[PDB]
Amino acid sequence: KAISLNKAGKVRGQTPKVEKSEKEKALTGRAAWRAKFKRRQELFTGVGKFKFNKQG
RNA sequence: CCUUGUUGCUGUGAAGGCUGGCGAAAGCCAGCUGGAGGCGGCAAGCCGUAUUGAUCUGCAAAUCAUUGGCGUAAGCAGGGUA
RNA sequence: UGAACUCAUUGUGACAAGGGGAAUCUGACUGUUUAGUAAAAACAUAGCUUCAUGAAGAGAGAUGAAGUGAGUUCUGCCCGGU
RNA sequence: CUAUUUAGACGUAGACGGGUACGGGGGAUUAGGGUUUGAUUCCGGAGAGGGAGCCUGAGAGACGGCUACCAGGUCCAAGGACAGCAGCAGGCGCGAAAAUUACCGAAGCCUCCAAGAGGGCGGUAGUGAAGAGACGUGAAAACAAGUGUGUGUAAAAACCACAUGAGUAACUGGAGGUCAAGGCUGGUGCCAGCAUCCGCGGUAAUACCAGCUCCAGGAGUGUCUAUGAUGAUUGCUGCGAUUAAAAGGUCCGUAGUCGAAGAACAGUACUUGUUUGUAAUGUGGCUUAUCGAGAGCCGAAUAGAACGAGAAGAGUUCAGAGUAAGGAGCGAAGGAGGGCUAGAUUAUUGAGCAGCGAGAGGUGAAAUUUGAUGACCUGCUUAGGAGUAACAGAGGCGAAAGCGCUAGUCAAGAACGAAUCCGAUGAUCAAGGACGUAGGCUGGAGGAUCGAAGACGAUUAGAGACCGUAGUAGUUCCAGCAGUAAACGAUGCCUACGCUGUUGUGGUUAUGAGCACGGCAGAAGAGAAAUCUAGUAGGGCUUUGGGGAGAGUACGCGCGCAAGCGAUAAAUUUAAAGGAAAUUGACGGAAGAACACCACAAGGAGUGGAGUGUGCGGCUUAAUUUGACUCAACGCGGGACAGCUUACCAUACCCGAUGGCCGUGUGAGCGUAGUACGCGAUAGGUCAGAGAGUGGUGCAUGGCCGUUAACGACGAGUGGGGUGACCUUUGGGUUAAGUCCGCGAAGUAGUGAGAUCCCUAGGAUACGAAAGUUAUCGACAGGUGUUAAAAACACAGGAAGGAAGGGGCAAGAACAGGUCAGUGAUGCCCUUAGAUGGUAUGGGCUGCACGCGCACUACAGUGGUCACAGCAGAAACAAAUAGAAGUAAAUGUGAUCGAGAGGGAAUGAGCACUGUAAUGUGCACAGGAACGAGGAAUUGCUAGUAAUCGUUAUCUCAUUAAGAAGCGAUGAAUGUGUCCCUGUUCUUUGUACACACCGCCCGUCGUUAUCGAAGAUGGAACCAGGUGCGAACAAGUGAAAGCGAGUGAGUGCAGGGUUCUAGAUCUGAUACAAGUCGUAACAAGGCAGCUGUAGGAGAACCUGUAGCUGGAUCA
């Protein structure tokens, strides 16, 4: 029974190209760690609930 | 059908037997002894495959040479008888 | 059965004396046949199967008639015609 | 190595052959016990393209020495010459795979005749994210990498010191679960892709493709491939074998592994001391480079060996010792244990003869078939070959397979009783040996019954099968071969420790009990449960399993006359497996209780047959619009259609939210006796996008209905049992109803029923003066009779008597039940000015060869006709001279008619009514069809019921009832039961179904792919041997010429041993979305299934014979 290869690549053609927006140089090493440690202060409490990423 | 004549040399090695080993048994393995067979190679013989040889006014109204098949046997043969 | 020495082509010295292997068709084997153009795959053979008979100087492990062809393995279906 | 003598040497504790390998010190992982690796700094071995010979030397069978062959090369003037990077750089190939044709009088060492010469050995840098350390990528005031001097070195660079500039510096994999972190926004619509595994995507994708935010590790992070761990899935420590994979059919037996008490003895294992035995690595430490890997120094150490010591266990010996270890023997007794000899009561067939005179046989029902040549049945005679009924059992015997009549005879064994004898003789078992139901095979004997194959008769779409008739090999015996079973208690053999009650068999007994071999019922433990040959446990020895498939198959080998059997692989494929047991449903062609005139039995009236009225299918037509199909479609869709209804056909006529773009008072359109007159923007073409439809899909839905069912079921706490899915427990009586009464590891409250309305029947003491109306009352099985309780009848009184009668309301769960043509209830698809939207005039829905469902008049006399009366539920009625809607009718009295004067179907010329229109209805006169009580079947109904008779101021309705829904008149007949039919509920029952029987599933045939066997004829390579021939070198002998043992490379010719590969054709397996033919298995799966063996067959499979329950029976 018939088979064909006519459709290879389809979705990569049809998805509209969007440009990457600019951003700062991010931290690295201990610098990144001081930044994370201040954000997560709630979580280091044994009560209440932190949430890393929410879209509401 | 009755009465007779005619088996020399060699190979292979069945049945039966004796020793030695192995095995709990049953019975297995060696070496020797024995000498069966419409069994092998030949002789005397009996036959007739090839050369499509010789001969074809023949040696001969069926022969000759070399080459072949069987040869311890449903083998070959004289006389008497049907 | 060994060993040594010896020879100018080497030694079953003349005579006598197997060529061998791989496959296929066919008949089991030894045996027989067209005297005088055919020796064969043809005939025979052991074994297998069928048939008829209580008659005998013979008495069913008998006496005659046919077909197939040792051994192994198989031998299906049809009694309308003759 | 050679001469003569002796036959040895080595093997199941694995010889010999083949395959594979540099060996250790050490490395990786690791709680422990282990599993894997070692070309690779140290030690020892071998080699220099492949083989072989050799001179020199203290030392080489040397290759940066020589000589010859074989395979390859280089230069030439063609005559000859040279050469070997598994040294250091470097090049080409091969591969998925690995650096510079660099500097060196310095460090560590080696070489010479040396106050010096040589060394790619060694050192120094360059190159590369194989590995391992320490740190940058900012701080809150103030941060690498640069540069210059000095150092450093053999010379350098880097490193470090001081001094100058300054302000540079993160990516890889992810975000549904395992597994840390987004239902974010846009594309795509089972596509494209993602995903180790599970799984995502069919237009609402937290999983694809991207954007944006988060997470993890970070100068690093992902992937592929080997291995160690995960893993008690290789089990010494430490798994399993009743049913999941797994105990050999039973014995004997060698090698092997394992083996009393008592008294003594000896030191080789065993354990331990002292001394040896380890550079690096590793282990326990300390000291110096800024720190940390690194470097330097210290201490102890494995296996292996030398010499002493201790004697528990192991070992050796002894007999004034004699196992709930074995063998020999004695006494009395028991048993379908085995071989042989001689007898037996019946039965089934066959023949003979006699009696009798028509059928016998076989089945669910029948046909083949046999009988007047006398069957069948009943007598008497006989001839054979099998078998041992009932007694006969959770009884006995045997190693298992197996063994059942009675006597006699011949060997051996088990158990029991007891002061017999010998003394370790024993347990288990590769190899080897003996037995083994049935079916089968080789030869003989025989042949009653039964019966594979083969042949018929039936049944079926087809039966080749199941059933019946018949019939052969076999089924029996003797002498052998064979070697398998669901050969199963699916539970190896010895030996232990272990609770109670009961019942057997054989001996013995202080009569209390024991010993051997059993059955049964609990308990406690155990186990995933079911259950227990399964409890406790490092006792000994053998067999044996490691996810499904392919496969107990291929090749080789051993046995067999054959049939075959024993033993046993790879390639390939796949996420689970009809894997195990237990829980809830659905299903069955099961079993057991119940119940009911919408079930039946015993009783009433009909339907099915005629004509007509009406609905359904079929056909016709321009159109005859359409839903619904077992109960639970068919006078049903409130479906009595002239128009309307109306969805269909013919002709004709009529009709548009908004927004953008394009035009307009010089007129964008409209009215008309329509073209010249009247009115004017209002309402104008095209793209988007809205808002009709009796158009489609009820398998996209809501609501409402119908049906299960008008049935007894049905949720909550707390409590008991089970690991849990789950059950609340023994099913005995009653009602319409788990409605109730008993009893319980259960007990307490609720829904449903019931109770709770409304109508109909009786009732003033209330109200009225009109004469009726309404009523909180009245009935409870209360009374009597029936001797547990719960109910019950039968009487009696009573207006009403066992749910007073009749309605009405009415659990949970269900169904792919009906309706989109009821709905401004509704998703999605379709049409939409030449409409699938409205309207009008007509035509159809009403056509007519024909099959069906439900009604109406009938078939007369228990009638027809004439007159006259007279009565309902209650109360409604211009007039009418033949006649043209209305206040009962059956019925009561008198006449009449007399067995087609019953009956009114098709049809004629008329006379009126309703209506917009007759085609519809009424009236008068004719006319006068079938039908003379209905085949197979089939439907309700228990009392003011059924049937009869009218009537509707009820519904449809201008006019049309032969339809429903009421209402009254006249008024019966039969049981008082049952589970047989027909159904419906509950409890036990089986399962490979859960998507739930419309389920699931087997095998041929045909088409594709992929991997493997065989096969006439064949190819490589690569090893060792056997024969030829023989280059180089050569001891010896010779003045010399020569001659030449021996060591041998290469190469002839035959063979073998290994590994690959070709091959016409045949034959397996696996995957085939769904192709063709059947339906073999799973329910009693429609003939219960399965194992062995033998025939047969399109194919699953079918048939004989023995076996098993994993069966549909613990009886």
Q: Report how far apart, in Å, the C-alpha atoms of A19 and of each of A10, A16, A22 are.
A: 21, 10, 9
* Share in percent of chain A as helix, strand, coil (round to 5): 25, 0, 75
Residues with CB under 7 A from strand D: A 7-12, 14-18, 20-21, 23, 25-32, 34, 36, 39-40, 51-56
Give phi and psi for A11, each to the nearest 5.
-65, -30
CA of residue A26 to C1' of nucleotide B82, angstroms: 144
Query: What count of other Cβ atoms lies within 10 Å of the Cβ of residue A12?
Result: 7
Q: Is A7 helix (H, G, I), strand (E, B) or coil?
A: coil
| Burial class of residue A23, CB neighbours in 10 A (0-12, 13-18, 19+) | exposed
Experimental method for this entry? cryo-EM
Give phi and psi for A34, each to the nearest 5.
-65, -40
- Give residues preceding each break in chain A, C–N over 2.5 A: none
Distance in angstroms (rounded) separating the CA atoms of residues A40 and A52? 9
> Which chain D nucleotides are covered by protein, judged by CB under 7 A?
136-139, 169-171, 175, 181-184, 186-188, 191-193, 208-216, 218-219
Q: Is A15 helix (H, G, I), strand (E, B) or coil?
A: coil
Q: Is A35 helix (H, G, I), strand (E, B) or coil?
A: helix
